[PDB]
Each structure stands twice: as structure tokens, then as C-alpha cells.
Design a protein around this ligand. Structure first.
Ligand SMILES: N=C(N)NCc1cn([C@@H]2[C@@H](OCCCl)O[C@H](CO)[C@@H](O)[C@@H]2O)nn1
Ligand SMILES: [Ca+2]
Ligand SMILES: [Cl-]
Length: 134
């Protein structure tokens, strides 16, 4: 199974680590432009994959998670809630809402809540295909 050039294959999906920095809303749009989605994490193994991808490039990166709803709870850009077994991935002391932080990112060894208006790297996810989707 194939991924586009400069996407990474992991367990049937393709992952794009951005070369540029954009705000969270612009990162949502950027992933949609390439038939993809600002990354929604579905399994522990996927989180482990992504956390090490980001940790080693030492890059802070947007994921598809925000509390921009009425409840103020963390929900994925596909509308699914943050499951209890993922609360462990927040960094020590996070989320801390330090300056109106509604958008989740990879930060060091876990997750951070950041201001949505910050320019950050991002990761897109789409299914692997029989062809390279350029
Ligand atoms: N995309 C990037 N640069 N991510 C890293 C990052 C973290 N923060 C904040 C900062 O707050 C301190 C005042 Cl800037 O660091 C605290 C952790 O100590 C945070 O909880 C808080 O979200 N701002 N950028
Ligand atoms: Ca924070
Ligand atoms: Cl880019």
C-alpha cells in the first residue's frame, strides 16, 4: 500500500508532517486541501508512533483536537470525544489553559493545550491507497 511522496505509512494510514507552520484552523483547512484530516488519534499504538515522530524532530505539532464546543470538553475534528484512556497523554500540568488555550498539540513527550492562533507544525492523516495520491 502507498502514501504520497513525503508522507509516512503507519498501519494502513498516511501521515504528513508539515514543512511550514500555521494556526490550528488553517491546519484543519491545509489537511482538507490534500484529501486528509488534521490527525485524529484512534489507537495507543498510533499515539506512540506520532509522539516519537514529533519528539525526535523535537517538533511541536497540531493534532485534530480542540475544546471549541459548548461543554468545553476535548473533542476530535471528526466529532468524536476524547476517550478516558487518552487523558494520560497530556504533559504533567496540562491542559492548563495558559492564556485561552483551546487547541491540542504534541509537545515533548506528551500533549499540550495551546492558543489556536499560534503558528505551529501540523500532521495530516488519510488512508493508504493502491497508488501515490499526489
Ligand atoms: N507550539 C508551541 N510552541 N508549543 C509550546 C508552547 C507551550 N506554550 C505555553 C507556555 O506557557 C508559558 C508562557 Cl509562554 O508553556 C506552558 C508549559 O510550560 C504551556 O502549558 C503553554 O501552553 N506555548 N507554547
Ligand atoms: Ca498549555
Ligand atoms: Cl508544509
Amino acid at each position: 500500500r502507498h502514501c504520497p511522496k513525503d508522507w509516512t505509512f503507519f498501519q494502513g494510514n498516511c501521515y504528513f508532517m508539515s514543512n511550514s507552520q500555521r494556526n490550528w484552523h488553517d491546519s484543519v483547512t491545509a489537511c482538507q486541501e490534500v484529501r486528509a484530516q488534521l490527525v485524529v488519534i484512534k489507537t495507543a499504538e498510533e499515539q506512540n508512533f506520532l509522539q516519537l515522530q514529533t519528539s525526535r524532530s523535537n517538533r511541536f505539532s497540531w493534532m485534530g483536537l480542540s475544546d471549541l464546543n459548548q461543554e468545553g470538553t476535548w473533542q476530535w475534528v471528526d466529532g468524536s470525544p476524547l476517550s478516558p484512556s487518552f487523558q494520560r497523554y497530556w504533559n504533567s500540568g496540562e491542559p492548563n489553559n495558559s492564556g485561552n488555550e483551546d487547541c491540542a498539540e504534541f509537545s515533548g513527550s506528551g500533549w499540550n493545550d495551546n492558543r489556536c492562533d499560534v503558528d505551529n507544525y501540523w500532521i495530516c492523516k488519510k488512508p493508504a491507497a493502491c497508488f501515490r495520491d499526489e
